[PDB]
Amino acid sequence: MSVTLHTDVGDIKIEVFCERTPKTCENFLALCASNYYNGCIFHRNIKGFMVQTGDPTGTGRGGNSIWGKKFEDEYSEYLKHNVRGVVSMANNGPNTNGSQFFITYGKQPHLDMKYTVFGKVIDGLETLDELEKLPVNEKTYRPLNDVHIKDITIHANPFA
Ligand code: NI
Ligand code: NI
Question: Which numeric CATH code is attached to 1-160?
Answer without folding.
Answer: 2.40.100.10
